[PDB]
Design an enzyme around this catalytic site. Structure first.
Site, PDB file in Angstrom:
ATOM      1  N   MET A 227      -4.389   8.385  12.654  1.00 24.23           N
ATOM      2  CA  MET A 227      -5.468   8.848  11.782  1.00 24.23           C
ATOM      3  C   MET A 227      -6.364   9.885  12.450  1.00 24.23           C
ATOM      4  O   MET A 227      -7.582   9.753  12.417  1.00 24.23           O
ATOM      5  CB  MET A 227      -6.332   7.654  11.342  1.00 24.23           C
ATOM      6  CG  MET A 227      -5.562   6.542  10.637  1.00 24.23           C
ATOM      7  SD  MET A 227      -6.423   4.951  10.669  1.00 24.23           S
ATOM      8  CE  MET A 227      -6.176   4.500  12.380  1.00 24.23           C
TER       9      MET A 227
ATOM     10  N   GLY B 197       7.061  10.483  10.067  1.00 23.52           N
ATOM     11  CA  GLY B 197       8.056  10.054  11.037  1.00 23.52           C
ATOM     12  C   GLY B 197       9.114   9.096  10.499  1.00 23.52           C
ATOM     13  O   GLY B 197       8.809   8.185   9.717  1.00 23.52           O
TER      14      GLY B 197
ATOM     15  N   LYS C  73      -4.539   3.355  -2.113  1.00 20.74           N
ATOM     16  CA  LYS C  73      -5.535   4.336  -2.498  1.00 20.74           C
ATOM     17  C   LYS C  73      -5.004   5.237  -3.638  1.00 20.74           C
ATOM     18  O   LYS C  73      -4.294   6.214  -3.398  1.00 20.74           O
ATOM     19  CB  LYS C  73      -5.888   5.095  -1.207  1.00 20.74           C
ATOM     20  CG  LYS C  73      -5.863   4.087  -0.011  1.00 20.74           C
ATOM     21  CD  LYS C  73      -6.119   4.617   1.403  1.00 20.74           C
ATOM     22  CE  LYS C  73      -6.226   3.422   2.381  1.00 20.74           C
ATOM     23  NZ  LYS C  73      -6.538   3.780   3.801  1.00 20.74           N
TER      24      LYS C  73
ATOM     25  N   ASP D 148       0.837  -1.202   0.000  1.00 24.46           N
ATOM     26  CA  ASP D 148       0.000   0.000   0.000  1.00 24.46           C
ATOM     27  C   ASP D 148       0.875   1.257   0.000  1.00 24.46           C
ATOM     28  O   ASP D 148       2.095   1.160  -0.037  1.00 24.46           O
ATOM     29  CB  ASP D 148      -0.958  -0.010   1.194  1.00 24.46           C
ATOM     30  CG  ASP D 148      -0.266  -0.333   2.483  1.00 24.46           C
ATOM     31  OD1 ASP D 148       0.509   0.518   2.967  1.00 24.46           O
ATOM     32  OD2 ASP D 148      -0.495  -1.444   3.012  1.00 24.46           O
TER      33      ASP D 148
HETATM   34  N1  LIG Z   1       5.725   7.783   8.965  1.00 23.80           N
HETATM   35  C1  LIG Z   1       4.687   8.129   9.708  1.00 23.80           C
HETATM   36  N2  LIG Z   1       4.731   9.262  10.447  1.00 23.80           N
HETATM   37  C2  LIG Z   1       3.705   9.619  11.232  1.00 23.80           C
HETATM   38  N3  LIG Z   1       2.605   8.859  11.292  1.00 23.80           N
HETATM   39  C3  LIG Z   1       2.508   7.714  10.575  1.00 23.80           C
HETATM   40  C4  LIG Z   1       3.546   7.328   9.752  1.00 23.80           C
HETATM   41  N4  LIG Z   1       3.191   6.187   9.162  1.00 23.80           N
HETATM   42  C5  LIG Z   1       1.962   5.865   9.588  1.00 23.80           C
HETATM   43  N5  LIG Z   1       1.542   6.803  10.454  1.00 23.80           N
HETATM   44  C6  LIG Z   1       0.239   6.824  11.186  1.00 23.80           C
HETATM   45  O1  LIG Z   1      -0.502   5.556  10.940  1.00 23.80           O
HETATM   46  C7  LIG Z   1      -1.797   5.887  10.356  1.00 23.80           C
HETATM   47  C8  LIG Z   1      -2.345   4.808   9.404  1.00 23.80           C
HETATM   48  S1  LIG Z   1      -2.966   3.305  10.265  1.00 23.80           S
HETATM   49  C9  LIG Z   1      -1.579   2.133  10.006  1.00 23.80           C
HETATM   50  C10 LIG Z   1      -0.547   2.148  11.147  1.00 23.80           C
HETATM   51  C11 LIG Z   1       0.528   1.066  10.955  1.00 23.80           C
HETATM   52  N6  LIG Z   1      -0.103  -0.267  10.973  1.00 23.80           N
HETATM   53  C12 LIG Z   1       1.562   1.159  12.087  1.00 23.80           C
HETATM   54  O2  LIG Z   1       1.717   0.154  12.806  1.00 23.80           O
HETATM   55  O3  LIG Z   1       2.168   2.238  12.212  1.00 23.80           O
HETATM   56  C13 LIG Z   1      -1.565   7.218   9.665  1.00 23.80           C
HETATM   57  O4  LIG Z   1      -2.797   7.944   9.599  1.00 23.80           O
HETATM   58  C14 LIG Z   1      -0.642   7.930  10.606  1.00 23.80           C
HETATM   59  O5  LIG Z   1      -1.396   8.545  11.649  1.00 23.80           O
END
Ligand SMILES: Nc1ncnc2c1ncn2[C@@H]1O[C@H](CSCC[C@H](N)C(=O)O)[C@@H](O)[C@H]1O
Ligand SMILES: NC(=O)c1ccc[n+]([C@@H]2O[C@H](COP(=O)([O-])OP(=O)(O)OC[C@H]3O[C@@H](n4cnc5c(N)ncnc54)[C@H](O)[C@@H]3O)[C@@H](O)[C@H]2O)c1
Ligand SMILES: NC(=O)c1ccc[n+]([C@H]2O[C@@H](COP(=O)([O-])OP(=O)(O)OC[C@H]3O[C@@H](n4cnc5c(N)ncnc54)[C@H](O)[C@@H]3O)[C@H](O)[C@@H]2O)c1
Ligand SMILES: Nc1ncnc2c1ncn2[C@@H]1O[C@H](CSCC[C@H](N)C(=O)O)[C@@H](O)[C@H]1O
Lengths: 454, 443
Positions: free
Chosen positions: A379, A408, A270, A248
Site C-alpha cells: 500500500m 503480481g 470497496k 473482498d
Molecule cells: N497481486 C498483487 N500484486 C501486487 N501487490 C499486491 C497484490 N495483491 C495485494 N498486493 C499488495 O497488498 C496490499 C493490500 S494489504 C493486504 C495484503 C494481503 N493480506 C497479503 O498477504 O498479500 C496492496 O496495496 C498491494 O500493495
C-alpha cells in the site's frame, strides 16, 4: 468394464517381485505400505533394498528368476527390463492362477496397478485400463486436492459414534445428514491427527449438541495474490464446503469461480471506489452467520494475518464459542517475488527482509534506509515519491535497485524497475494493487525473470 | 494403507460365487460385465440367474457348497444368508491362496469389493474397508458427477494414438507436451462426443504437425512449513507430473507422499553439487522439481539454484509457498500484524544490527537461530528492547507434532532449550494474542 477393481488385504501375505532396479522399488514401497510379506528376486539390487533387508522389511533372493518362489504367493509383479524374463514370470504366475502384473506391459498380464489416492482406510484408485497413464495422473492429482489430508481419521472414528447416532437420530434421512456433516468436519479430523483429546471431545459433542442442520464455524482463508493456482489445497477444500463466502476485491475472479455455486457470497469490498464496509460490521456478520449455524469462509486476499486483519475478525469468535480456524495463503510479497524473478533473499545482498505498510503514526526512515536488508512496501503507491526523498535523505544510495510489481502472479502482471532515484517516477507507471521492492536483490531479475510481463 | 487396490483382468478366468439371492446377483452382474467365466453355487436361485443360465453367460451348481468348485478359480465371493457357509467358503479360498470376499463381513477374508465409477476404459474405485460405508457411498455420488460422462472416449482415443505419437516425436517431453495439449483440447473432446471424425482428424493432424519443445526444465516449488494441505494447487500439479524431485528434510513426509509415485527422488549435498544435479537432469530433458521447505525465495537458496540456468538455455519457473513465518505464526494463533501493534514485519537469520532490530513498532521472526538465541535477547535488551516483551518459539509449525512455548525476552534463551529444531522465534507484541486466537493445538 474391461477390468474389475478389487481391494486386496496384503498384511502378512506372500508376494513376489522380480527385479531390483528403480521400477521394482516403487512396487515394493507400495506393497510394503500395504503390509505384504515381500520376497524380491533379482540379479542385483539398488541400495534401498539393502536398507530394507537390513531392518526386517523384506527378504532378498539374489540370482535369476526362481519359479518355485511363486508356490505360495498371492501376487507377483514382473519388474525387470528384460521382456523375455517378465514373460516367464507372467506365464509361471498364470499357470498357478496367481494374479500378476507385468510392468512394462499393462494388458499382457493378470492385473493393472492403478494410481492410488491414500486416505486410509479411505482409498480411491484410478486406472486408464492401459490407454493413458497421463490421464490417470491427471485424475490422481485432481482427486488428491479434493480429499483432505486427514479424511482417514474421521473414517476410522465414525465407528465410535455409530451407536450414539442411531440413538439420537431415529430416521435414516437424519442419520445420513449427520454423516454428511461429520465427514466434512476438518477441525475434528485435525484434532484426531493431533491427538488433542479435549478438542476431539469438545468438537464431538458440538456435533451432537447443535441442531442437525447447523454447521456453525468461521474459517479465515488466504486466497493468495490472484493466481488460482496459488490457493492452498486446504483453502480449496474449505471453499468447496462453505455455505457462505465473505470476500473482498483482492480475491481474484478465477479464485471465486472455485467457490461452490449457491454458497452465498457477500462482497464486503470497496464498491465502485466509494462504499466500503466498516470492520466491526464485517466482524459481526462472520460471528452472526456462524451463530446461525453456517459454515462461514472469510476469503482474504493474499494471507489473512499480514496487513488484512483476520486477527480482528477472530478475537470476537473466541468468545461466542464459535469454533474457528485459519488457512494461511501466499502473501503478495511471496507471490510477486517468485513471479518477477526477484528473490527476497540471495547470498550476499541481504538476510533481513522487511514487510512494511505504506499509507495514525508515521514511517521510521533510517530503520528503513539501512542495510544488508530487502524492503517490500504494501500500500505505498501514493507515497512513492515521498518514500524516494525520505530514503535517499537518510543515507540510502541513489543507485540502489528498485522495482514495482502490479497485479503480481496474475495474467496481467506488470513489472517495472530501475534505480531508487526513479521510484516515484516508475510508480506513476503502475496502478493498485502493487508492491514496491527496494534492494540489491532487484538486479537478480536479469538472470531469473521467467514470467511474461504486461 | 490397509488395502492395496488392483484392477484384475477376468476374461476367461474362472470365478466362483456361492449364493444365489439378491446380494449374490449384483456381484455376479459385475463379474459378468468384467467378462469372467462364472460359476454360481447355491441352494436356491432367483429368476435372473436362470435367465443368465440359458444365454450361456454362466454355469449353475444347485445344492450345498462344494469346496472343489474353487479348484480352478481366481476369485471367490461368498454371498449366502448363512454366516457359517460363508466362512467355510473363505477357508476353502484361503487354503488355495484365492482372493475372497464375504459380502456382509468386510473385516474377514482377503478382499473387499469397492464402489465403482465407470467411464471405460477409464475407471475409478472407492472404498472404506467397511469402516465408513456411508463415506464411500457419498464419495461415489460426488465422483459420479465430477467425472464427465464421455471421458472414456478421450481415453480410448489416447491409447489408439500412442503408436503414432512415439513414431513422430523423439524425446520423452514432446510427447508429454503432446498429451498436455491433447487432454486440454475441449474441441477434440466435444468432437469425440458427437462422433465427428472430420473435426477429430483435423484437430489431430495439427497436433502431430506441431513444433514441440524437447528441453526439460527446473521448477522451484515451495512445500510450505509441513502441513500437506498448505501446498498450493500448482505446487501439487508440479510434483504430481514431474520426472524427478529433489527434496530436503524440511519437506514433510505427508508432502513427499503427494509426489508422483513414478518419479525419481534425490535427497539433499553442497549447494553447488545440488546446483549441478538440477541442470544436469534438465539437460537430459527431464522435468525437475526442486521441492524446498516453506518458500524458495526466502532463506532457501532458490536464487542460487536458478541463476545459471538462463546461461544454460534451460527453462525454469517458480511456485511460491507458505513461508515458515506465515504458517507457524497463524498456526500458533499469533498474527504477524494487528491494529497499530506493528505495521512492519522482519524475517531474520541466525554480526547483526541490533539497534534496528530492537526498535519497535515492529514484529520479528528468526529463522535458524535456536542456538544463537541467548545472544539475541542479551543484545536486544541491551539495544533498547523492553524485557516484558512476549516472545514465542514454534517447533515443527503446521505439523501434527507442533509445540509452542511462550514467555518474555528475559526467558528467551531459556525457552530456546525447551525446544529443538526446526523451530522459529517470534519476537513482538502480537504474541500476546496467542490465547484469544489459538486454534490448532492445546500444545
Ligand atoms: N497481486 C498483487 N500484486 C501486487 N501487490 C499486491 C497484490 N495483491 C495485494 N498486493 C499488495 O497488498 C496490499 C493490500 S494489504 C493486504 C495484503 C494481503 N493480506 C497479503 O498477504 O498479500 C496492496 O496495496 C498491494 O500493495
Ligand atoms: N519397463 C521398464 O524397464 C521401464 C518402464 C518405465 C520406466 N523405466 C525406467 O527405467 C529406469 C529403471 O529401470 P529399472 O526400474 O528396471 O531399473 P534398473 O534398470 O536399474 O533395474 C532393472 C532390474 O532388472 C534386473 N534384471 C535384468 N535381467 C535380469 C534377469 N535375467 N534376471 C533377474 N533380473 C534381471 C536387474 O537385476 C535390475 O534389478 C527407471 O528409473 C524408470 O525411469 C523402465
Ligand atoms: N427367495 C429367498 O430365498 C428369499 C426371499 C425372501 C427372503 N429371504 C431370506 O434370505 C436371507 C438373506 O440372505 P441374503 O442376505 O444373502 O440375501 P439373498 O437374497 O442374497 O439370499 C441368500 C442366498 O444364499 C443361497 N444359499 C444360502 N445358503 C446356501 C448354502 N449353504 N449353500 C448354497 N447356497 C446357499 C440361496 O440360494 C439364496 O439365494 C434372509 O434370511 C431373508 O429373510 C429369502
Ligand atoms: N515447520 C517449521 N516450524 C518452525 N520453523 C520452521 C519450519 N519449517 C522451516 N522452519 C524455519 O526455516 C528454517 C530453515 S531456512 C528455510 C525457510 C523456508 N524457505 C521458508 O520460507 O520458511 C528453519 O531453521 C526454521 O527456522
Amino acid at each position: 468394464m474391461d477390468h474389475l477393481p478389487i481391494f486386496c488385504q496384503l498384511r502378512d501375505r506372500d508376494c513376489l517381485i522380480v527385479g531390483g532396479g528403480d521400477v521394482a522399488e516403487r512396487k515394493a514401497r507400495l506393497l510394503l505400505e500395504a503390509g505384504a510379506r515381500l520376497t524380491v528376486n533379482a540379479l542385483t539390487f539398488i541400495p534401498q533394498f539393502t536398507v530394507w533387508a537390513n531392518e526386517g522389511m523384506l527378504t532378498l533372493v539374489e540370482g535369476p528368476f526362481d519359479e518355485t518362489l511363486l508356490d505360495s504367493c498371492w501376487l507377483a509383479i514382473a519388474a525387470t527390463d528384460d521382456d523375455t524374463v517378465n514373460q516367464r514370470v507372467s506365464d509361471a504366475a498364470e499357470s498357478r492362477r496367481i494374479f500378476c502384473n507385468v510392468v512394462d506391459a499393462p494388458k499382457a498380464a493378470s492385473f493393472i496397478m492403478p494410481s492410488i489416492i491414500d486416505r486410509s482406510p479411505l482409498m480411491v484408485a484410478v486406472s486408464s485400463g492401459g490407454t493413458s497413464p497421463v490421464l490417470a495422473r491427471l485424475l490422481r492429482e485432481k482427486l488428491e486436492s479434493l480429499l483432505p489430508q486427514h479424511l482417514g481419521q474421521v473414517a476410522r472414528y465414525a465407528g465410535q459414534l455409530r451407536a450414539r447416532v442411531k440413538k439420537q437420530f431415529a430416521t435414516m434421512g437424519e442419520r445420513r445428514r449427520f454423516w454428511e456433516k461429520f465427514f466434512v468436519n476438518d477441525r475434528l479430523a485435525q484434532s484426531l491427527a493431533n491427538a488433542d483429546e479435549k478438542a476431539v471431545n469438545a468438537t464431538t459433542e458440538r456435533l451432537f449438541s447443535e441442531p442437525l442442520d447447523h454447521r456453525g464455524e468461521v474459517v479465515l482463508v488466504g486466497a493468495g495474490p490472484g493466481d488460482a493456482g496459488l490457493l492452498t489445497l486446504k483453502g480449496l477444500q474449505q471453499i468447496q464446503q462453505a455455505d457462505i463466502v465473505v470476500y473482498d476485491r483482492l480475491v481474484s475472479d478465477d479464485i471465486m469461480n472455485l467457490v461452490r455455486r449457491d454458497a452465498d457470497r457477500v462482497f464486503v469490498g470497496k464498491r465502485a471506489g466509494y462504499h466500503c464496509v466498516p470492520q466491526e460490521e464485517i466482524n459481526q456478520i462472520l460471528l452472526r452467520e456462524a451463530q446461525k449455524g453456517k459454515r462461514v469462509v472469510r476469503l482474504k486476499g493474499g494471507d489473512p494475518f499480514i496487513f488484512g486483519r483476520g486477527g480482528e475478525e477472530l478475537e470476537t469468535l473466541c468468545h461466542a464459542g464459535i469454533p474457528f480456524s485459519v488457512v494461511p495463503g501466499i502473501t503478495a510479497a511471496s507471490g510477486c517475488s517468485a513471479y518477477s524473478g526477484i528473490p527476497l533473499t540471495h547470498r550476499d545482498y541481504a538476510q533481513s527482509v522487511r514487510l512494511v505498510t505504506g499509507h495514525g503514526g508515521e514511517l521510521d526512515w533510517e530503520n528503513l534506509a539501512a542495510e544488508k536488508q530487502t524492503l517490500v512496501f504494501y500500500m505505498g503507491l501514493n507515497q512513492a515519491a515521498t518514500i524516494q526523498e525520505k530514503l535517499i535523505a537518510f543515507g540510502m544510495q541513489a543507485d540502489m535497485p528498485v522495482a514495482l510489481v502490479e497485479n503480481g502472479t496474475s495474467v496481467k502482471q506488470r513489472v517495472v524497475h530501475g534505480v531508487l532515484t526513479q521510484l516515484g517516477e516508475l510508480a506513476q507507471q503502475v496502478e493498485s494493487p502493487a508492491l514496491i521492492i527496494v534492494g540489491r536483490v532487484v538486479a537478480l531479475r536479469d538472470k531469473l525473470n521467467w514470467f511474461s510481463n504486461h
